[PDB]
Design a binder for this molecule. Structure first.
Ligand SMILES: [Mg+2]
Length: 437
DNA sequence: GGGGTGTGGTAG
DNA sequence: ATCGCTACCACACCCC
């Protein structure tokens, strides 16, 4: 048990944190892509007609945790039993759940406590531990398999278990549904074999946005092919409003108030006008939804196809620790900030780049929130405070950055005992070049 | 036309 | 117990 004033805390937290793991795995895939395309111009161009194959493991952690489960769980049955992956028994996040679990209304991000109430009497919830290293090995087999198929002109990592795979179509070839259905089936069988039993679903279209919706429609363990040509009312009626890219709970809520609670993308499509939509959720998001409702990608999302090296290139660097934060005095806060800065500078020197602007953000207990929140070591209900600082010269010097970071903390005025969360960010990065005179 | 900062949504 | 990250965009509002 590692307290936040222990020099080992960051290492233990990050080793246990599935969200940290997902972020680092994602950054590593993006750097790997860059280091492999330092010479290629494998880009998509305006002259290219292309098909999108958007691929994603089904209930990834739960599948892998099951395939690699310990002998204590030998008798657990992935097709019969409700299965979650999590650390604990109560206010512990469900990181993944199998489709047995989901059939009872369990969803990712639920606490185990809430999930247990959703089961009928007599049905027991199976809780598997994380298998982080094997999560990564299955991801290697995934990406290895996609490259070996030699059917994609461009392979874009979205995450450890999800990729957007681009196939250029010569106008010498006439596109058909049967041919894309056969590719989908090959991809699914080769990944199933290559990962020793994980399954993927696949959305296939002539736009990124349709391919992502088709993928949602295709789950679980299936595929769906919906081109712009094939759009119909049954397609749009299949999706909730927050299935759209960039529509979360907050945008969802605004769309409902504005348009009298549409219950499907079809309802939204029939009621909206671009004007009122921009007024509801903003000019850029509104245009994006409007484009999305015609099955069309926006200019921003298309850049990943025409310039993936620039899209995937890292523009900032940060850590966020909003769990386990309980400090008694300012001395312990300063030491934790120094540790965070050290960690971040190891990451910064890995990619050979200086930083010109830093930010400290923190979470502070709401004046009326309990000192000890419902979730053990959780941040609870908090107010956010943030402040940034331009560095004179771009630097990687600990003495400069750490001092400024500790200074930033003092400017935000948070008493150490009220602190519940800390983010440390390098907001602008400058390349290091061969001439340093 | 350019530049800025803090806050906050979303993704996956 | 329990591991509530992190990159990126968009906004409201401010300066010249
Ligand atoms: Mg959404």
């Amino acid at each position: 048990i590692v307290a936040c004033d222990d020099p080992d805390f960051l290492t233990s937290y990050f080793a246990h944190s599935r969200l940290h793991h997902l972020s680092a795995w994602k950054a590593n895939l993006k750097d790997k892509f860059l280091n492999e395309n330092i010479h290629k111009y494998t880009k998509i161009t305006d002259k290219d007609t292309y098909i999108i194959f958007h691929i994603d493991f089904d209930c990834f952690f739960a599948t892998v945790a099951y395939l690699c489960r310990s002998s204590s769980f030998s008798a657990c049955d992935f097709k019969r039993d409700p299965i979650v992956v999590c650390h604990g028994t109560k206010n512990s996040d469900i990181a993944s759940c199998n489709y047995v679990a989901r059939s009872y209304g369990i969803k990712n991000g639920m606490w185990v406590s809430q999930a247990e109430k959703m089961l009928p009497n007599g049905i027991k919830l199976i809780s598997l531990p994380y298998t982080f290293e094997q999560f990564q090995l299955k991801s290697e087999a995934f990406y290895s398999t996609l490259k070996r198929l030699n059917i994609f002109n461009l392979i874009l990592p979205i995450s450890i278990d999800e990729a957007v795979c681009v196939r250029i179509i010569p106008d010498n070839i006439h596109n058909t549904n049967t041919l894309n259905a056969r590719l989908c089936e090959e991809i699914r069988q080769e990944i199933f074999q290559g990962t020793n039993g994980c399954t993927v679903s696949i959305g296939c279209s002539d736009s990124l946005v349709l391919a992502r919706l088709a993928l949602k429609m295709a789950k679980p363990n299936g595929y769906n092919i919906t081109f712009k040509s094939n759009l119909s009312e049954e397609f749009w009626s299949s999706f909730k409003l927050d299935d759209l890219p960039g529509v979360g709970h907050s945008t969802l809520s605004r769309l409902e108030s504005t348009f009298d609670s549409p219950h499907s993308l079809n309802d939204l499509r029939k009621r909206y006008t671009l004007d009122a939509l921009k007024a509801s959720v903003g000019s850029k998001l509104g245009m994006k939804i409007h484009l999305a409702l015609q099955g069309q990608d926006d200019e921003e999302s298309l850049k990943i196809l025409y310039d993936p090296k620039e899209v995937l290139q890292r523009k900032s660097l940060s850590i966020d620790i909003n769990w386990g934060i309980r400090f008694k005095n300012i001395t312990q806060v300063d030491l934790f900030i120094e540790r965070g800065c050290q960690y971040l500078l190891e990451k910064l020197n890995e990619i050979n780049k200086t930083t010109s602007q830093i930010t400290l953000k923190l979470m502070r207990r709401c004046k009326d929130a309990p000192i000890e929140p419902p979730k053990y070591m959780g941040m609870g209900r908090c107010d956010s405070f943030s402040r940034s600082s331009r560095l004179g010269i771009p630097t990687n010097e600990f003495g400069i950055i750490a001092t400024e970071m500790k200074s930033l903390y003092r400017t935000l005025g948070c008493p150490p005992m009220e602190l519940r969360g800390l983010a440390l960010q390098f907001n602008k990065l400058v390349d290091v070049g061969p001439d340093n005179n």
